[PDB]
Amino acid sequence: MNLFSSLTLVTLILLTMPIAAINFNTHKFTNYPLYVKTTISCAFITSMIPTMMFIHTGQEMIISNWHWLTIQTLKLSLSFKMDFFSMMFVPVALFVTWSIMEFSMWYMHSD
Amino acid sequence: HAFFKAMLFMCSGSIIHSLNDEQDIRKMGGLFKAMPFTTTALIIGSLALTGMPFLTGFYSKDLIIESANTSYTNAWALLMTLVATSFTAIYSTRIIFFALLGQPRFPTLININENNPFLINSIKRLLIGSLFAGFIISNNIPPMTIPQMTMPHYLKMTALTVTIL
Amino acid sequence: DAPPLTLEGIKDRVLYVLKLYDKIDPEKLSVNSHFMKDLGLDSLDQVEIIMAMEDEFGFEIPDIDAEKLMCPQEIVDYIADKKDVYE
Amino acid sequence: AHIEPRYRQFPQLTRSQVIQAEFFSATMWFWILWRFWHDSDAVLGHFPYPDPSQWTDEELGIPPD
Amino acid sequence: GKRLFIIKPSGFY
Amino acid sequence: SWDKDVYPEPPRRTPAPSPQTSLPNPITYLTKAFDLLVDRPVTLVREFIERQHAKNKYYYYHREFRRVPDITECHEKDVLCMFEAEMQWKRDYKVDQEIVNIIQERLKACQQREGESHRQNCAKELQQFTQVVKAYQDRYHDLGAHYSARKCLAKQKQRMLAERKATKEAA
Amino acid sequence: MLKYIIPTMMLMPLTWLSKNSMIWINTTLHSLLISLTSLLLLNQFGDNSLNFSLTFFSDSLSTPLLILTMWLLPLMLMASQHHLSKENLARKKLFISMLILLQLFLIMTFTATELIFFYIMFEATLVPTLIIITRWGNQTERLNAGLYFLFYTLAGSLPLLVALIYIQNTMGSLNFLILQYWVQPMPNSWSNTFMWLACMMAFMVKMPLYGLHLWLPKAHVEAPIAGSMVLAAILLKLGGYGMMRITLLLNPITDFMAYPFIMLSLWGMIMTSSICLRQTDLKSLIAYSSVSHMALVIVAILIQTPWSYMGATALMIAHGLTSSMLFCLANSNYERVHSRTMILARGLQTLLPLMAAWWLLASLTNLALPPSINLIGELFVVMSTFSWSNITIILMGLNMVITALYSLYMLITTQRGKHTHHINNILPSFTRENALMSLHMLPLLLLSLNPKIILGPLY
Amino acid sequence: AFLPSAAYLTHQQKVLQLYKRALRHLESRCVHRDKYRYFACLLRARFDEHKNEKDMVKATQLLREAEKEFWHGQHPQPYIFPESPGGTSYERYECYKVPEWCLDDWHPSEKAMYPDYFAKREQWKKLRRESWEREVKQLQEETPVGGPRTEALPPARKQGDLPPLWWHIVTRPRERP
Amino acid sequence: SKMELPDYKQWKIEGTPLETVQEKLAARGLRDPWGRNEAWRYMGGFANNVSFVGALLKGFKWGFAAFVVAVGAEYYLES
Amino acid sequence: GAHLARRYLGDASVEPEPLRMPTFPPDYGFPERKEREMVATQQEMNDAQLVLQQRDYCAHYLIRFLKCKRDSFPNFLACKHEQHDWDYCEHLDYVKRMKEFERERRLLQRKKRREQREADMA
Amino acid sequence: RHSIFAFTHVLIPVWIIHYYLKYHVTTKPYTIVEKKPRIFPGDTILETGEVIPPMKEFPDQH
Amino acid sequence: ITKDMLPGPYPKTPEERAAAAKKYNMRVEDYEPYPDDGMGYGDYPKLPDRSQQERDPWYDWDHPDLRLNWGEPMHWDLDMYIRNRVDTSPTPVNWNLMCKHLFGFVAFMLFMFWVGETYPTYQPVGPKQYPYNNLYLERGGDPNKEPEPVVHYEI
Ligand SMILES: CCCCCCCCCCCCCCCCCC(=O)OC[C@H](COP(=O)([O-])OC[C@H](O)COP(=O)([O-])OC[C@H](COC(=O)CCCCCCCCCCCCCCCCC)OC(=O)CCCCCCCCCCCCCCCCC)OC(=O)CCCCCCCCCCCCCCCCC
Ligand SMILES: CCCCCCCCCCCCCCCCCC(=O)OC[C@H](COP(=O)([O-])OCC[N+](C)(C)C)OC(=O)CCCCCCCCCCCCCCCCC
Ligand SMILES: CCCCCCCCCCCCCCCCCC(=O)OC[C@H](COP(=O)([O-])OCC[N+](C)(C)C)OC(=O)CCCCCCCCCCCCCCCCC
Ligand SMILES: CCCCCCCCCCCCCCCCCC(=O)OC[C@H](COP(=O)(O)OCCN)OC(=O)CCCCCCCCCCCCCCCCC
Numbered sequence A: 001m002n003l004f005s006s007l008t009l010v011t012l013i014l015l016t017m018p019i020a021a022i023n024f025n026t027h028k029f030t031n032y033p034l035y036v037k038t039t040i041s042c043a044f045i046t047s048m049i050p051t052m053m054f055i056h057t058g059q060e061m062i063i064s065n066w067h068w069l070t071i072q073t074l075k076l077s078l079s080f081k082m083d084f085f086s087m088m089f090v091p092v093a094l095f096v097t098w099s100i101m102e103f104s105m106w107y108m109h110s111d
Numbered sequence B: 001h002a003f004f005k006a007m008l009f010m011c012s013g014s015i016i017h018s019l020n021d022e023q024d025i026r027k028m029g030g031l032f033k034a035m036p037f038t039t040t041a042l043i044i045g046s047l048a049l050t051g052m053p054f055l056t057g058f059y060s061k062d063l064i065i066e067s068a069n070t071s072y073t074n075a076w077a078l079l080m081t082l083v084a085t086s087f088t089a090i091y092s093t094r095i096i097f098f099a100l101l102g103q104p105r106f107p108t109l110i111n112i113n114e115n116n117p118f119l120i121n122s123i124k125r126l127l128i129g130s131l132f133a134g135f136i137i138s139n140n141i142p143p144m145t146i147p148q149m150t151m152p153h154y155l156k157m158t159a160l161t162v163t164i165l
Numbered sequence C: 001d002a003p004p005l006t007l008e009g010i011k012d013r014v015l016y017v018l019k020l021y022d023k024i025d026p027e028k029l030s031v032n033s034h035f036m037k038d039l040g041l042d043s044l045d046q047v048e049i050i051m052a053m054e055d056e057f058g059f060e061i062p063d064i065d066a067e068k069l070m071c072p073q074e075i076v077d078y079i080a081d082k083k084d085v086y087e
Numbered sequence D: 001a002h003i004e005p006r007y008r009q010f011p012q013l014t015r016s017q018v019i020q021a022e023f024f025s026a027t028m029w030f031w032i033l034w035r036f037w038h039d040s041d042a043v044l045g046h047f048p049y050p051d052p053s054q055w056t057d058e059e060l061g062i063p064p065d
Numbered sequence E: 001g002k003r004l005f006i007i008k009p010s011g012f013y
Numbered sequence F: 001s002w003d004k005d006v007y008p009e010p011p012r013r014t015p016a017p018s019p020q021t022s023l024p025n026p027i028t029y030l031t032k033a034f035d036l037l038v039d040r041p042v043t044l045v046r047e048f049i050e051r052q053h054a055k056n057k058y059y060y061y062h063r064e065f066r067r068v069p070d071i072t073e074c075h076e077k078d079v080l081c082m083f084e085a086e087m088q089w090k091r092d093y094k095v096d097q098e099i100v101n102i103i104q105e106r107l108k109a110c111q112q113r114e115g116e117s118h119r120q121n122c123a124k125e126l127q128q129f130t131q132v133v134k135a136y137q138d139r140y141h142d143l144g145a146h147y148s149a150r151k152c153l154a155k156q157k158q159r160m161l162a163e164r165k166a167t168k169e170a171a
Numbered sequence G: 001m002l003k004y005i006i007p008t009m010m011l012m013p014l015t016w017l018s019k020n021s022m023i024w025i026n027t028t029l030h031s032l033l034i035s036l037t038s039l040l041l042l043n044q045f046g047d048n049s050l051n052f053s054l055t056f057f058s059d060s061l062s063t064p065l066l067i068l069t070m071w072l073l074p075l076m077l078m079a080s081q082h083h084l085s086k087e088n089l090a091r092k093k094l095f096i097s098m099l100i101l102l103q104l105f106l107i108m109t110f111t112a113t114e115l116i117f118f119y120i121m122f123e124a125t126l127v128p129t130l131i132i133i134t135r136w137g138n139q140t141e142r143l144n145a146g147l148y149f150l151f152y153t154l155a156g157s158l159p160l161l162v163a164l165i166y167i168q169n170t171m172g173s174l175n176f177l178i179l180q181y182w183v184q185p186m187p188n189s190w191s192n193t194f195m196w197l198a199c200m201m202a203f204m205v206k207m208p209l210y211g212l213h214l215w216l217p218k219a220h221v222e223a224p225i226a227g228s229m230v231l232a233a234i235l236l237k238l239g240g241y242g243m244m245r246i247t248l249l250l251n252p253i254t255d256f257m258a259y260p261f262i263m264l265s266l267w268g269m270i271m272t273s274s275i276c277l278r279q280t281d282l283k284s285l286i287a288y289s290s291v292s293h294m295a296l297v298i299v300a301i302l303i304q305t306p307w308s309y310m311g312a313t314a315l316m317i318a319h320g321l322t323s324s325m326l327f328c329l330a331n332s333n334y335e336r337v338h339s340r341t342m343i344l345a346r347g348l349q350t351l352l353p354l355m356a357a358w359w360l361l362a363s364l365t366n367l368a369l370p371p372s373i374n375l376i377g378e379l380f381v382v383m384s385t386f387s388w389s390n391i392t393i394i395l396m397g398l399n400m401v402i403t404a405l406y407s408l409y410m411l412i413t414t415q416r417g418k419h420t421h422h423i424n425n426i427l428p429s430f431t432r433e434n435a436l437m438s439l440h441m442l443p444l445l446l447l448s449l450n451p452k453i454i455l456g457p458l459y
Numbered sequence H: 001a002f003l004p005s006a007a008y009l010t011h012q013q014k015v016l017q018l019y020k021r022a023l024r025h026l027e028s029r030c031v032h033r034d035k036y037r038y039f040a041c042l043l044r045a046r047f048d049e050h051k052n053e054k055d056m057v058k059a060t061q062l063l064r065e066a067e068k069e070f071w072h073g074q075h076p077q078p079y080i081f082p083e084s085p086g087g088t089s090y091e092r093y094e095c096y097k098v099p100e101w102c103l104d105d106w107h108p109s110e111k112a113m114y115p116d117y118f119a120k121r122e123q124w125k126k127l128r129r130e131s132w133e134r135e136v137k138q139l140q141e142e143t144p145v146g147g148p149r150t151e152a153l154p155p156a157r158k159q160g161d162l163p164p165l166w167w168h169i170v171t172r173p174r175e176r177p
Numbered sequence I: 001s002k003m004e005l006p007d008y009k010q011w012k013i014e015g016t017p018l019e020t021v022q023e024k025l026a027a028r029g030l031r032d033p034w035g036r037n038e039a040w041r042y043m044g045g046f047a048n049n050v051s052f053v054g055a056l057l058k059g060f061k062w063g064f065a066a067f068v069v070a071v072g073a074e075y076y077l078e079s
Numbered sequence J: 001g002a003h004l005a006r007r008y009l010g011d012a013s014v015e016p017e018p019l020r021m022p023t024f025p026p027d028y029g030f031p032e033r034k035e036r037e038m039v040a041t042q043q044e045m046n047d048a049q050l051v052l053q054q055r056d057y058c059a060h061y062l063i064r065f066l067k068c069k070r071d072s073f074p075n076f077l078a079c080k081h082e083q084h085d086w087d088y089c090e091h092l093d094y095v096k097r098m099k100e101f102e103r104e105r106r107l108l109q110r111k112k113r114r115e116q117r118e119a120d121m122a
Numbered sequence K: 001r002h003s004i005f006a007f008t009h010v011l012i013p014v015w016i017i018h019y020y021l022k023y024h025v026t027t028k029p030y031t032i033v034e035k036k037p038r039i040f041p042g043d044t045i046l047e048t049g050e051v052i053p054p055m056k057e058f059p060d061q062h
Numbered sequence L: 001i002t003k004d005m006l007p008g009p010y011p012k013t014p015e016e017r018a019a020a021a022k023k024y025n026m027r028v029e030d031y032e033p034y035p036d037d038g039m040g041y042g043d044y045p046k047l048p049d050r051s052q053q054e055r056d057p058w059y060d061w062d063h064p065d066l067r068l069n070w071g072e073p074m075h076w077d078l079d080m081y082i083r084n085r086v087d088t089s090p091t092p093v094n095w096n097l098m099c100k101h102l103f104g105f106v107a108f109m110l111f112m113f114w115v116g117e118t119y120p121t122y123q124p125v126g127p128k129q130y131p132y133n134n135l136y137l138e139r140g141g142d143p144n145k146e147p148e149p150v151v152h153y154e155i
């Protein structure tokens, strides 16, 4: 449980970290595209662990970690569903996006 | 579909960048040998799109056609799905014919170059995906339905025959 | 990608396409050869010459500009102006 | 040395891109032939489809009257 | 070689 | 932690690992790496912070409202009594809202927990959900944005007249 | 409430005794201190309102309106100090005095326990607003604008006065706390029909109701920037606040008196949003978008469910911040090109990229991008109106198409495309301008983290 | 129809524009270069048949039914050059074409980063402001009464003068900035 | 810097489909003047490109060789 | 797909309707017909969390295959035999469904011949 | 400082998120609800030791 | 700007039409106002109702993205006929024939989906057989009640 949910949230927080880096900047970056591509390759690697332990046991969970707002009988929480659909789509999207960004370091180089 | 379709757009963008932002297939051609890695990956992606057996599109789309044939189905929807399956082969070889085969139709100052490690490695990982990812995913996912595996021979061979036609 | 054009390179390519044209003898051709007065060409021939220039350099010359390019040097100057050569 | 552009003629090719392209084409055909050798039923059919006309009335329970 | 000045608006402010 | 009666869970039955292959799975090695590299430093930091809490222990309290007279035993237009009745009614309405939220949390936790056999194994939570939503609906629905204890009492008296008329006509 | 009223009044000797170079700095500083002080009003309870005295109270409806009101004054001073730089010093102090006086009238409009004192502060807000528009507005039409703003209000509000005094003669009190417990049902009659109209039409004008809205695309357009900021952000919400207070007394007749007005709002938000697709004046487009957004608040207050009141107060706070920011962005382009024509200065992202990012964020909040409080209010009103009648989703959903379409068109026309060649006075964005945009946009986005403080008394 | 210098298109200009449009659409229909080359020679033979036509009413009639011929036989998606209007890369770089006057609004700390560039910019600005009054008085001594007839501008006539209204032609952005 | 263009005299349309085009134009009294401009597309390294089934069967030879080697390898490894 | 042409272009009175069939009793033509034996316990496929589509008369091979697929991780190619056993028993179930279809079609042919013989005789 | 990326972008977030999940999220009810593990005939329960009995013997088909 | 260069009322006398044609920088023979039916157009010219996409793109426009010169009278719906919006350009297929082909294709496809819904395809099989009274407890049937026995037999 503690491996699954932690690496699940680490994948998403890791994706948010270069946004925080580019918004808190002063200099001209030493290849910010390489940093975003490295981050997404690492998020692919980190997302493969809950995917493997879903392939092992069928391990699914829901992380309702932050209560956001209760409209009288509708409790809205920041809630993440780690089921088959997320467990397969997140690594495929991260793998494809990692290829798209290493492609973009070439294709968008003049930009 | 993610693997081979992202790779087909990346191969198209490799062609577009090598031909100085040319995107029309009537000003292409002769790129079989001039862009060999883009050619290899474009042919592998077009075969994965059309459902070549045991590439990645086979492990989903062929099962989709077999399940759509052998089910209580709107028959016109099935027939239009099969006509669309033949049309996929038609536009895939339209891409391969006008972009890669034949003789050049692009301008005379050839700047054809795909020798960047970024381009090669990024197309390479989706190429390994377009070869093996359908096999790996379809043998790792749990059964969630009961797969229909008993059907007559003309109905098992529908998708492959329609694609070949 | 996209190698920069020079005036000598544009001049060489314009004269190259005109030397590959069977209605122009390549020994009489120069950069100042007027197509109608020196080379004896038709206006349809001039339209075809500008279309071959367009196919050569990969961009369109509009018809209000194409009808005024009556020697190779005017074509070279037009392509120079539209591509900003010798920065 | 990077690729120098050419005029009206076939471009310069690196040896590396040619051997990579040939390797992945050969890998595709190896994978197709290997999986067709080992599976052969995802393409051609897994189980024999029975003929309903060949079924006798005894096993289907049809009393002749 | 042949580096060109890129005209851009003032990014100081 | 919490109270395991208001938020119940069935006992966890995990199966013992019965490996059939000779290949070592990466999940056990990554679990050991998560226990060493992650779980022990987090545990040591939390033990430090917990010692710092235990150095200065202090308490907070759950506020107990005693029961004041409700709106039925307040004289009409007597604002001093019906103010307190209205405040009591608003607190009870907010608590009934949270009771419905507790039962919905039980229903959703059962649906995730029982998984693919959720429809058979969550009939009790579904039945408790149906009962508490029927009670909440009879008590508070259709009162409007300007609800009060008077609106709720008028709704209850209308419902009781309908029930009395249905009992009278069926006998 | 007197811990806010007295510092707001002390801003008057603060502006009139300041040194001539210090009158913007001092009033900005101490109005920001009053705005920091305004968070003590968040002592709200789940059952009782925060009842200070016989004269003043503050529940969770009035509290975000008060915090937004006290927050808008420093932002109005920042927005107005540049175009009043060449002004006479005493007229500059009179301008700041009108803004201070308007804040003073607003903060005891929203906290007025008794309804006729609400009426007097509510109508007292007219006089500084009229003076600001007609004296410091830029064009001729401000004079005509000052008439429309004056006379759609009073023609609606003088029947309210009579109506309130009638309640004073019937209930014996106009204390809202007493009227919470002494409210009697209002049956179907003609007398109660015109009672309903007299109670509602002043606030219908203030919102504005569609068909009564014509004062707004003159009053918000011809005003100076601080005038437009307070008109769109606060003074429209006097109508919604007053409806949410006054519909306590109007039950059950509202259940069929709301039917025409709901139609006027549900079709009106289709009309005015469509009007925004063909506006050539950018500031007029922002004004008509305010009419379209307040149409939802009218529908939500008239259907009077908990979800609709929560959505309506969230949408009032969110629209206050968003419309005030949009008027400030349009003013930042007006202070460079000196025309409010939207097609004039194009391609401004090539010239002003950070201000283009502010345009982007304000457009995204205008089209109610989740999870902004714009979308929270929008969505909760849509939920409640779907429960009212399932067909309303058509007129709701189509509105959200058109709202997207005019929001990005505004963003595409001014920021994108090719820049206008002959315009060469596009100065880089001043620190004051980006500061004004951030002081709108950063609290607006931070309220998505904790939106329960802007969900009103029946959260 | 709409031209900066001429008020109209002559018949010869209409024939040549039809010939170029017909060859481009024929190349779109006839993708391969030898097949286009054959049919382009056939189309040139169709244009050379009525080339020596002296009757201008007959020539205008032939041009009109040739336009009907073209409108029936045009390609639905003809080839457009990428930077040409309607192309896939047309006006792509206009977001990067910052005008030169924005350099006047740079801070002195970022003007000091390019000392020789701005020192060379100031003599362009000096040249422009000493050329302006001479080129205005050139335009008003050369434009006829009632205003200019065409949009054509004159060249510089003296040695030392610049052509009138030259600054935004010369200092225009690059196509690839 | 300086780019050396190839010679223009080498681009002759004999042996190309432009020769067939010129023959079919001269059969009806016409002549193609732009053939040598197009002649480079059909000459050199751009002449004799593969067909479509030759494009699909790229790498089939080495793939089939590796297939035969792997089948023989598992057929010897099972015993 | 010849049965589609026999139902749609031919007569539908002799062709079985799929949405409502069998229309004949199951003992009609069978002396001592036996029931289908369910191997997997209801609690066993409840605890195995099978999909309700998958809890048919051959779910026991599916339970064996899923236990193999769990126990042989990461070797995901190591349970071809259990998968083929489940696929073959699903094949046998589908053949039984085909036999039910052919049984209903031949009994409708019997009813057609019965009513035609009754019309021609009496 | 050669693998500072795996320290600052992976391991410090795994530390922070594991602290947050272990001591603030799972200390609250129904925040991480996991699907109960799939039980097969023949399994042994770790919490109890009760061996799940195997299935009935198959009427073998092939 | 001043008052005699602003738009005004509908021109009635020919000298008023001439001076308002001079105001909008256009010929008197080209100036046509909107017809005076009281809609509020005044003397503003009715320009030929074409999109700005139809303008010559190779001309040196003062506003190149708008394809519009300085001082040229703008169309009443210029913000509508920008190139981001309504295009009126000539189409290779006629408008009515395009509408006929699109409507005929969509109507034929909807008709044939209705036909194939009325006559569906299926396989020559019986219904799928589930044990335990068609999985009565699994589908949510209550255990205190007892359903009718759904019995399946061998074949
Ligand atoms: C209480 C503590 C809170 C801490 C956390 C903060 C919470 C949010 C607060 C508000 C944050 C906004 C600040 C940045 C935007 C405005 C300024 C700007 O543009 O600067 C560009 C600049 C970097 O750009 P540049 O290259 O230098 O120049 C810009 C270019 O000119 C060209 O610019 P550009 O166009 O390339 O780039 C602009 C780009 C443009 O990108 C977009 O417009 C796309 C955004 C929409 C799509 C993606 C997001 C969709 C929604 C998902 C996210 C929310 C939910 C996530 C949770 C999981 C799911 C539920 O915007 C961004 O990248 C901004 C990222 C964040 C976007 C937030 C959503 C805005 C969309 C509209 C409303 C949506 C709903 C509200 C959401 C509220 C969430 C809290 O940024 C800065 O310098 C940042 C300065 C410091 C910012 C401080 C922020 C907090 C202030 C609060 C103070 C008080 C509390 C203390 C907290 C302090 C924390 C450090
Ligand atoms: C790099 C900075 C990170 C922190 C560095 C310093 C700390 C180092 C590591 C230790 C961690 C800190 C201690 C643990 C954290 C606090 C735990 C805790 O109990 O916190 C109290 C609570 C936890 O929730 P809660 O349920 O206890 O309380 C919520 C409050 N009520 C009940 C009133 C609703 O708050 C947080 O943790 C806040 C952080 C939330 C993180 C996600 C933010 C997403 C923002 C999206 C905005 C819009 C949402 C809209 C959609 C919502 C869904 C529909
Ligand atoms: C912004 C423009 C539109 C503004 C609209 C404003 C509201 C429209 C309706 C106003 C009606 C007049 C005030 C009603 C106050 C109700 C008080 C009350 O107790 O009513 C019940 C009382 C009942 O009398 P009573 O209460 O003394 O009787 C005892 C009770 N019964 C009936 C049981 C015996 O109503 C009246 O006395 C008359 C009400 C109608 C008045 C008709 C005359 C005015 C018509 C409308 C004018 C509106 C503005 C015109 C100007 C427009 C702009 C230039
Ligand atoms: C499961 C059910 C499935 C049902 C499927 C069928 C239902 C929908 C039927 C069609 C309705 C939508 C299509 C019509 C609107 C499309 C507008 C659009 O895309 O305009 C594009 C146009 C220019 O685009 P284009 O010419 O292609 O660009 C080439 C480069 N110049 O750009 C412009 O002209 C810009 C115009 C901006 C303003 C647009 C105003 C129109 C808004 C229409 C809203 C319709 C709302 C419908 C609500 C329904 C509620 C249920």
Ligand SMILES: *C(=O)CCCCCCCCCCCCC
Binding pocket: B069, B082, B154, B155, B158, B161, B162, J001, J002, J003, J004, L121, L122
């Ligand atoms: C009877 O025909 C059963 C098969 C399903 C209905 C007809 C489907 C026809 C299309 C599939 C076969 C195509 C062969 C090329």
